[PDB]
């Protein structure tokens, strides 16, 4: 398994497991799950009410010092009743490490904003509200950031179609750019590329 | 910059959007005589930075 | 009915409407509005143009890919007309000039060209022919314009009994020569009575006359909902525009009252609601800026 | 492992002070910039005389698409639809049926040159080297509809550019 | 090609043509497939 | 096998440092030149 | 490289550097545009024995 | 069944927020008409505002109508400042859109759409 | 109490931005997809899928 | 293989635009250094992973 | 006759003046603007054809749309196009401006800039090379050369 | 081997031609319809059959790596030749 297989890191896996135990034991009020992946990445899944305390602890603790917020993302998984999974990626320059903090919310429940901890969260969760419709309570200035000014609907949700519901064209009668119901000269062709055979037995789900 | 674009086009066939680095390595091997041109360009680039 | 001409879609830009229209004089003003209305339904439009293609550049984005076909034509050449109309099923005639020039007088523009177009479209088997006349057209009129238009209308009717003849009264819009004429003259007031009609209503009437199978052989008179005297019309135009090219034939046509023809069907019989001038006067004359409505008789 | 850009303290003796003040009063570095731009005036410019001189290219260059043939007149495409499956922009439409002698040939092969991103995935997914990206790049059109190629246009492009496409393939096929 | 001439093939054009955009010889797109659905032609005789 | 490779002895030197010539006279010399030009003009 | 010696001297004086040593315009020093054909090596899995994919 | 509120605990404060948003839109409609040089009157703009509020008037969940008030507030702020152009303001009025038939017979005539 | 009581049915149609005629005139279908008879694998019949009815497709006049 | 090449990292001192411009110029120089090192240490072998 | 000869020579004069002093404005939207900048480089030298570098929108002749025209950008593009003095020309650069390109089926991309403005020359590529945009500019010059405005005016 | 129509329109190698009453012939008015004059079905018919002395044959299209994937053709039937599925070349056993 030498030339064509990715070498495995075990010291980092042990250190990340120990730090996951450390965090999940310091904060039992919000932490629900702690896992470490195959490629040595630590994910801490927490309750949505403890977004501010967990992030402030990870930012300010002497043994954490996660001073950088790299990326803030939402993921749309429609089969869950809390379909939106909000993911914080943090970087610690003191210990040269990275962590992942995950929480959940649905369409109608707001999430506490983390601008008071990290200042990149302003534009990041403004984009999250724009694309997934997740409201962030106690935000300084929450509006749209990437979509059109009159756009209706959140495009990164999975029930939103690839091509939207409206399209723009210039009309000479009103001398203006107008929005009309979408009609495609060629329909986007859907491809069924999924193999009917199981690829990875290690990820096999148990039957009902 | 045009010279470096020539390097990109010689290795991939496109000046800007090479689509060269792919998961698993690179799509095509370097053609013969490319690294000599890279060496000459990098030899003169010090004077180019100095003049800027 | 061919398989490629059966309508499909939802009436959008990419749809198929089944209307193959050859619009003569589509580079003007009414033709521009008509091509815009035809192209948004997804119709095949053939535009025979006389001028530089730089003028047809504005007509180019009015339809989908392959939906507008530009071709060169000559007024006195029947071969170009046969080249243009032999594949369509409706031919619209909008050729006109407000003045006569060295190469084309009013008899060439209003009599010979419509007669040639109608004869060729009859010989090419075109189902629908629509020809745009004038409302005040009369054989005894003092203006050469209206006399020649009446003669051309009679000739078109006699050479194409299924032709639809349309008599618009006076058309105002963004690029017209009626409200823009009064606003730019900075010519007088008399006992003349007029009922101008909006351009969009005329375009909708033309489209509905294309669509309606019972409009063949009829003669419609498109007039507006309100009749105005000339003097208070000019005063209203000057008051809206915040203002405190011509010929003698235009002077005679301005001082000619708009006749009343209750026998002829109008816009209300094609399902078109006429737009009054008060709603669109600000839109037309906002460009001239740097109001009490007019009195209707 | 790191270096300190802009951490040079200025000397405070009379020599350095008078040098800096003379540079201020007499504008020395401005003369330096003027003189070097003057030196750059007297060089031969790098401008080539288009269209009489063309910029250098490589046998891997990706330009206009073409459909090739075997060296017997028979076309190479056998309607396997790999190029339209791998196309990242969905620019290829293929429809196939068995022809008169039972061969597996396309009846429709459209490439939308306004959708295509000129990525070369189709010419490397082809098992028979049928579709290629030729070396031609000067094919600007005055109309949108002229950029919607059918099978006949691509076959004509192949017949037009075979004498160069075959040479480029012969030069490059050992790197694949 | 005065030194290394290209391979001669019978289908290769003997006459090179430049860019014909804006000319009467310009390329016009069309569908190369035939009709899919065949219609029912009614009989030309009366039912009597 | 034939491949695009560096030579056995490698390539030649390639500079990567800043190079500024530091040409011209001193402050005293240029001030003396200017004062001498002024004196000649006044004379 | 076609410049005269006087223009070369003025160019080098005004630039402050020997411009002829490092010319930005390429000449016959670069590699040829026609190369002999290559022979690329194979990877470590190109073996006839002890090459089971499950390993 | 207990859920976390957004702004309104029950329906009364939500109705107050709806009332305030309608008052703000009704006040701003003349300035929006004047500043954007629209071709409509003030009455048509106020009728459009009332039409949107009436279209959106069948909801009984306090959190849903809180989000609706929030999105309306964003639209109002987007219009008070000149961020929308004339096209974004006029996109509420579908002038170029063809009239969609509603009865069964015309839909039967024009296509297969139910 | 930071937790309010809502006894109404969950409905979010006023927030999704979908036009109403793509809500009231569409029929969603919830089903486990059939195994392709050309293959013996059963990995594609594990998950439920929801899709929609097929509308009109026509032919482009140009291509 | 960025751990097998030797280069320096420019570090500013005042946080202004001038220090960032100097950092970009020095990063150009260090890129030239890494380019020379990559030219002198190119190994033979294949270009894609052999997992077909 | 004499008049046709006079208007033909005058048409040649005005077409030579217009086609040899094309002042472009460039919409720096996306990748294709970087390739436009590379055509303005010393190697290809757009200036030597009489085609200046980055002229004002209020005095330009040809407008180049180099990049993707999104839904948020289209009214601004139309507003800039409407303010240009005639004779005005539009060149579409790259697939994004030609027909949408990679992002054709996106929810926020206009499928071609010809849905907003009339387009004269379509330059294909992604990105089209500096050679290709230079060829498109020279083809636009050829199109301007064979204009017949004064002959059309005389014949009408 | 091109063919014309009563309209006067050329017929492509796929058999496509616009109908006489079809309105889509207007796109070729003032322009031309592009067809390929080299019909591959007629061109592959001129290739002589290759006679070999084996029970099976192998075809790669000529050029090795520049052809199609190598296939094997059986020549047991005497009533018909063995056509390659890729290149269309046919083979016949000598006996
Ligand atoms: N108020 C009005 O405008 C009314 C108009 N009408 C009728 O409606 C029609 C269109 O009117 P309108 O748009 O205002 O007028 P325009 O002058 O704007 O348009 C007339 C069109 O006819 C073309 N044309 C004119 N003379 C000739 C010729 N000798 N040979 C070929 N083409 C020619 C012009 O082409 P090009 O510009 O390329 O030369 C132009 O496209 C006319 O028939 C007019 O009589 C009727 C009632 C009221
Ligand atoms: S080059 Fe890429 S985008 Fe273009 S047709 Fe081929 S696969 Fe599609
Ligand atoms: S990949 Fe090649 S053989 Fe397959 S359909 Fe495309 S062009 Fe034809
Ligand atoms: S056409 Fe290609 S290169 Fe040009 S802007 Fe679009 S993605 Fe970028
Ligand atoms: Zn074969």
Automatic annotation (TrEMBL), chain D:
<keyword id="KW-0411">Iron-sulfur</keyword>
<dbReference type="GO" id="GO:0008137">
    <property type="term" value="F:NADH dehydrogenase (ubiquinone) activity"/>
</dbReference>
<keyword id="KW-0813">Transport</keyword>
<keyword id="KW-0479">Metal-binding</keyword>
<feature type="binding site">
    <location>
        <position position="119"/>
    </location>
    <ligand>
        <name>[4Fe-4S] cluster 2</name>
    </ligand>
</feature>
<keyword id="KW-0679">Respiratory chain</keyword>
<keyword id="KW-0249">Electron transport</keyword>
<comment type="similarity">
    <text>Belongs to the complex I 23 kDa subunit family.</text>
</comment>
<dbReference type="GO" id="GO:0032981">
    <property type="term" value="P:mitochondrial respiratory chain complex I assembly"/>
</dbReference>
<feature type="binding site">
    <location>
        <position position="80"/>
    </location>
    <ligand>
        <name>[4Fe-4S] cluster 1</name>
    </ligand>
</feature>
<dbReference type="GO" id="GO:0003954">
    <property type="term" value="F:NADH dehydrogenase activity"/>
</dbReference>
<dbReference type="GO" id="GO:0051539">
    <property type="term" value="F:4 iron, 4 sulfur cluster binding"/>
</dbReference>
UniProtKB/TrEMBL annotation, chain F:
<comment type="function">
    <text>Accessory subunit of the mitochondrial membrane respiratory chain NADH dehydrogenase (Complex I), that is believed not to be involved in catalysis. Complex I functions in the transfer of electrons from NADH to the respiratory chain. The immediate electron acceptor for the enzyme is believed to be ubiquinone. Involved in the interferon/all-trans-retinoic acid (IFN/RA) induced cell death. This apoptotic activity is inhibited by interaction with viral IRF1. Prevents the transactivation of STAT3 target genes.</text>
</comment>
<comment type="subunit">
    <text>Complex I is composed of 45 different subunits. Interacts with CARD15, but not with CARD4. Interacts with STAT3, but not with STAT1, STAT2 and STAT5A. Interacts with OLFM4.</text>
</comment>
<feature type="transmembrane region" description="Helical">
    <location>
        <begin position="25"/>
        <end position="43"/>
    </location>
</feature>
<protein>
    <recommendedName>
        <fullName>NADH dehydrogenase [ubiquinone] 1 alpha subcomplex subunit 13</fullName>
    </recommendedName>
</protein>
<comment type="function">
    <text>Complex I functions in the transfer of electrons from NADH to the respiratory chain. Accessory subunit of the mitochondrial membrane respiratory chain NADH dehydrogenase (Complex I), that is believed not to be involved in catalysis.</text>
</comment>
<comment type="similarity">
    <text>Belongs to the complex I NDUFA13 subunit family.</text>
</comment>
TrEMBL record, chain J:
<comment type="similarity">
    <text>Belongs to the complex I 49 kDa subunit family.</text>
</comment>
<protein>
    <recommendedName>
        <fullName>NADH dehydrogenase [ubiquinone] iron-sulfur protein 2, mitochondrial</fullName>
    </recommendedName>
</protein>
<comment type="subunit">
    <text>Core subunit of respiratory chain NADH dehydrogenase (Complex I) which is composed of 45 different subunits. Component of the iron-sulfur (IP) fragment of the enzyme. Interacts with NDUFAF3. Interacts with NDUFAF7. Interacts with CERS2.</text>
</comment>
TrEMBL record, chain L:
<keyword id="KW-0813">Transport</keyword>
<comment type="similarity">
    <text>Belongs to the complex I NDUFS6 subunit family.</text>
</comment>
<keyword id="KW-0479">Metal-binding</keyword>
<keyword id="KW-0999">Mitochondrion inner membrane</keyword>
<feature type="binding site">
    <location>
        <position position="84"/>
    </location>
    <ligand>
        <name>Zn(2+)</name>
    </ligand>
</feature>
<keyword id="KW-0809">Transit peptide</keyword>
<protein>
    <recommendedName>
        <fullName>NADH dehydrogenase [ubiquinone] iron-sulfur protein 6, mitochondrial</fullName>
    </recommendedName>
</protein>
<keyword id="KW-0249">Electron transport</keyword>
<keyword id="KW-0862">Zinc</keyword>
<comment type="function">
    <text>Accessory subunit of the mitochondrial membrane respiratory chain NADH dehydrogenase (Complex I), that is believed not to be involved in catalysis. Complex I functions in the transfer of electrons from NADH to the respiratory chain. The immediate electron acceptor for the enzyme is believed to be ubiquinone.</text>
</comment>
<feature type="binding site">
    <location>
        <position position="87"/>
    </location>
    <ligand>
        <name>Zn(2+)</name>
    </ligand>
</feature>
<dbReference type="GO" id="GO:0005743">
    <property type="term" value="C:mitochondrial inner membrane"/>
</dbReference>
């Amino acid at each position: 398994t030498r030339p064509t297989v990715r070498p495995r890191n075990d010291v980092a896996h042990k250190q990340l497991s120990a730090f996951g135990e450390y965090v999940a034991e310091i904060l039992p009020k919000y932490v629900q799950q702690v896992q470490v992946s195959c490629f040595s990445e630590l994910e801490i899944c927490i309750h949505p009410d403890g977004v501010i305390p967990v992030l402030t602890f990870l930012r300010d603790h002497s043994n954490a010092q996660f001073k950088s917020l790299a990326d803030l993302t939402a993921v749309d998984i429609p089969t869950r009743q809390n379909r939106f999974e909000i993911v914080y990626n943090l970087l610690s320059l003191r210990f040269n490490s990275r962590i992942r903090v995950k929480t959940y919310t649905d369409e109608l429940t707001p999430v506490e904003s983390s601008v008071s901890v990290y200042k990149a969260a302003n534009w990041y969760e403004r984009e999250i509200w724009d694309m997934f419709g997740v409201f962030f309570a106690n935000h300084p200035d929450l509006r749209r950031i990437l979509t059109d000014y009159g756009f209706e609907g959140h495009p990164f949700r999975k029930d939103f179609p690839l091509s939207g519901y409206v399209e723009l064209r210039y009309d000479d009668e009103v001398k203006r750019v107008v929005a009309e119901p979408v009609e495609l000269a060629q329909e986007f062709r859907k491809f069924d590329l999924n193999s009917p055979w199981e690829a990875f037995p290690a990820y096999r789900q148990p039957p009902e | 910059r045009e010279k470096m674009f020539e390097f990109y086009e010689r290795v991939s066939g496109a000046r800007m959007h090479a689509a060269y680095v792919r998961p698993g390595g690179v799509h095509q091997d370097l053609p013969l005589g490319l690294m000599d041109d890279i060496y000459e360009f990098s030899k003169n680039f010090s004077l180019r930075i100095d003049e800027l | 009915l061919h398989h490629a001409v059966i309508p499909h879609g939802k009436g959008g830009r990419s749809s198929v409407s089944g209307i193959v229209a050859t619009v003569f004089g589509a580079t003007g003003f009414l033709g521009r509005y008509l091509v815009n209305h035809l192209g948004r339904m997804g119709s095949q439009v053939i535009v025979p143009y006389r001028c530089e293609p730089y003028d047809t550049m504005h007509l180019r984005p009015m339809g989908d890919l392959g939906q507008i076909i530009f071709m060169d034509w000559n007024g006195r050449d029947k071969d170009s007309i046969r080249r243009a109309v032999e594949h369509s099923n409706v031919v619209i005639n909008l050729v006109g000039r407000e003045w006569e020039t060295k190469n084309f007088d009013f008899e060439d523009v209003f009599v010979k060209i419509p007669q040639a177009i109608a004869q060729v479209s009859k010989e090419a088997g075109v189902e629908k022919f629509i020809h745009i006349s004038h409302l005040n057209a009369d054989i005894k009129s003092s203006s050469k314009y209206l006399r020649n238009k009446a003669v051309g209308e009679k000739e078109v009717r006699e050479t194409f009994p299924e032709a639809t003849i349309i008599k618009p009264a006076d058309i105002f819009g963004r690029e017209d020569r009626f409200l823009n004429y009064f606003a730019n003259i900075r010519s007088l007031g008399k006992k003349t009575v007029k009922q101008p009609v909006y351009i969009v209503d005329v375009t909708k009437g033309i489209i509905n006359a294309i669509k309606d199978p019972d409009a063949r052989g009829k003669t419609f008179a498109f007039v507006g909902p309100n009749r105005y005297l000339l003097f208070d019309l000019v005063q209203y135009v000057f008051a809206v525009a915040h203002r405190p090219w011509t010929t003698r034939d235009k002077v005679e046509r301005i001082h000619t009252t708009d006749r009343t023809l209750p026998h002829l069907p109008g816009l209300e019989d094609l399902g078109v609601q006429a737009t009054p001038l008060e709603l669109k006067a600000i839109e037309v004359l906002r460009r001239h800026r740097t109001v009490q409505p007019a009195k209707t008789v | 492992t790191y270096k300190y850009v802009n951490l040079r303290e200025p000397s405070m003796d009379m020599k350095s002070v008078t040098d800096r003040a003379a540079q201020t009063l007499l504008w020395t570095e401005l003369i330096r910039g003027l003189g070097m731009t003057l030196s750059y005036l007297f060089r031969e410019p790098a401008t080539i005389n288009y269209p009489f001189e063309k910029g250098p290219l490589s046998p891997r260059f990706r330009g206009e698409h073409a459909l090739r043939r075997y060296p017997s007149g028979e076309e190479r495409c056998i309607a396997c639809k790999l190029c339209e499956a791998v196309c990242p922009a969905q620019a290829i439409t293929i429809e196939a049926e068995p022809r008169a002698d039972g061969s597996r040939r396309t009846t429709r092969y459209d490439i939308d040159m306004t959708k295509c991103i000129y990525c070369g995935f189709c010419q490397e997914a082809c098992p028979v080297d049928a579709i290629v990206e030729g070396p031609n790049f000067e094919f600007s059109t005055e109309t949108h509809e002229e950029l919607l190629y059918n099978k006949e246009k691509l076959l004509n492009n192949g017949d037009k550019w075979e004498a160069e496409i075959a040479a480029n393939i012969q030069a490059d096929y050992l790197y694949r | 090609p005065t030194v290394k001439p290209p391979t001669a093939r019978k289908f290769i054009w003997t006459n090179h043509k430049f860019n014909l955009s804006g000319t009467p010889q310009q390329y016009v797109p069309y569908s190369t497939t035939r009709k899919k659905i065949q219609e029912w032609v009614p009989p030309s005789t009366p039912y009597k | 096998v034939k491949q695009d490779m560096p030579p056995v002895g490698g390539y030649g030197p390639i500079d990567y440092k800043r190079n500024l010539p530091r040409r011209g006279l001193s402050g005293y010399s240029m001030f003396a030149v200017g004062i001498g030009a002024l004196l000649f003009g006044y004379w | 490289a076609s410049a005269t010696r006087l223009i070369q001297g003025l160019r080098n004086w005004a630039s402050g550097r020997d411009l002829q040593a490092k010319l930005q315009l390429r000449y016959q020093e670069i590699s040829k545009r026609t190369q002999p054909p290559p022979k690329l090596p194979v990877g470590p899995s190109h073996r006839l024995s002890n090459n089971y994919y499950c390993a | 069944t207990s859920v976390k509120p957004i702004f309104s605990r029950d329906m009364n404060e939500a109705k107050r927020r709806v009332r305030e948003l309608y008052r703000a839109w009704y006040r701003e409609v003349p300035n929006t008409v004047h500043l954007f040089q629209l071709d409509i009157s003030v009455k048509q703009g106020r009728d459009k505002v009332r039409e949107m509020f009436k279209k959106n008037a069948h909801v009984t969940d306090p959190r849903v109508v809180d989000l609706l008030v929030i999105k309306g507030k964003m639209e109002l702020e987007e219009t008070i400042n000149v961020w929308k152009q004339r096209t974004h303001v006029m996109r509420f009025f579908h002038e170029t859109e063809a009239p969609r038939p509603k009865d069964f017979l015309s839909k039967f005539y024009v296509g297969h759409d139910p | 109490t930071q937790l309010i009581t809502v006894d109404e049915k969950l409905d979010i149609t006023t927030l999704t931005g979908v036009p109403e005629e793509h809500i009231k005139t569409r029929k969603a279908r919830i089903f486990v997809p059939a195994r392709n008879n050309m293959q013996s694998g059963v990995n594609n019949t594990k998950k439920w899928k929801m899709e929609f009815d097929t509308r009109e497709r026509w032919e482009n006049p140009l291509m | 293989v960025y751990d097998q090449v030797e280069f320096d990292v420019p570090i500013g001192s005042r946080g202004d635009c001038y220090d960032r411009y100097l950092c970009r110029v020095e990063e150009m120089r260090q890129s030239i250094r890494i380019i020379s090192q990559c030219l002198n240490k190119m190994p033979p072998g294949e270009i894609k992973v052999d997992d077909a | 006759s004499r008049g046709e000869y006079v208007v033909a020579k005058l048409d040649d004069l005005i077409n030579w003046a217009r086609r040899s002093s094309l002042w472009p404005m460039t919409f720096g939207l996306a990748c294709c603007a970087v390739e436009m900048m590379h055509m303005a480089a010393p190697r290809y030298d757009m200036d030597r054809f009489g085609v200046v570098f980055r002229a004002s929108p209020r005095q330009s002749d040809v407008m180049i749309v180099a990049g993707t025209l999104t839904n948020k950008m289209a009214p601004a593009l139309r507003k800039v196009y409407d303010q240009m003095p005639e004779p005005r020309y539009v060149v579409s650069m790259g697939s994004c401006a030609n027909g949408g390109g990679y992002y054709h089926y996106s929810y926020s991309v206009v499928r071609g800039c010809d849905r907003i403005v009339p387009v004269d020359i379509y330059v294909p590529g992604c990105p089209p090379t500096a050679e290709a945009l230079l060829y498109g500019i020279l083809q636009l010059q050829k199109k301007i050369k064979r204009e017949k405005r004064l002959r059309i005016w005389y014949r009408r | 081997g091109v063919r014309t129509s009563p309209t006067g329109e050329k017929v492509t190698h796929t058999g496509q031609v616009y109908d006489d009453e079809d309105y889509r012939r207007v796109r070729f008015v003032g322009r031309q319809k592009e067809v390929n004059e080299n019909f591959a079905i007629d061109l592959i018919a001129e290739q002589p059959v290759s006679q070999v002395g084996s029970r099976v044959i192998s075809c790669d299209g000529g050029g090795g790596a520049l052809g199609h994937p190598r296939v094997y053709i059986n020549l047991d039937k005497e009533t018909k030749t063995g056509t390659c599925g890729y290149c269309g070349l046919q083979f016949r056993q000598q006996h």
